[PDB]
Amino acid sequence: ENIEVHMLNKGAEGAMVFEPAYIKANPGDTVTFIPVDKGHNVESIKDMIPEGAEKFKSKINENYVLTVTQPGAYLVKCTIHYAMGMIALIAVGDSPANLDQIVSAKKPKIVQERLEKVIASAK
Ligand SMILES: [Cu+2]
């Protein structure tokens, strides 16, 4: 299956967001990131992707189709607006083994609050 994600300057949760910012997927699924607004990209955060998944980085303003394989949680960001809270969390499979680690990992205070909200009122 495919899951469409939009990158926007302004969304329900504020400025610089991924909608949806919580993505539940299965191995083999694809996630397509569409920058409806310009000046955005998608990139995996170091140490916040699973076991053997490979890191990735898209081009600014480009549509990017990610194929998810390894089960576990992935924290991704917009390289350009990471500091302002632009993140999305992808959960591949049930009970992702690295979720608690990611939630504890060090990262900007604004992304943390955003991350807390996506796991809470959502899932
Ligand atoms: Cu951005």
Method: X-ray
> How remote is the CA of residue 77 from the centroid of ligand 1, in Å?
8
Beta-carbon contacts of residue 19 (< 8 Å; ≥ 6 apart): 5, 6, 8, 11, 12
Structure tokens belonging to residue 96: 């992702």
> How remote is the CA of residue 79 from the centroid of ligand 1, in Å?
7
> How remote is the CA of residue 103 from the centroid of ligand 1, in Å?
21
In angstroms, rounded to a whole number, what is the distance separating the alpha carbons of residues 44 and 47?
9
Domains and CATH numbers, the chain: 1-123 (2.60.40.420)
Among 90, 24, 8, residue whose Cα is nearest residue 56: 90
> How remote is the CA of residue 40 from the centroid of ligand 1, in Å?
4
Helix (H, G, I), strand (E, B) or coil at 103: helix
In angstroms, rounded to a whole number, what is the distance separating the alpha carbons of residues 56 and 112?
21
Helix (H) or strand (E) holding 6: strand 2-11
Residue 81 annotated as binding site: yes
> How remote is the CA of residue 42 from the centroid of ligand 1, in Å?
8
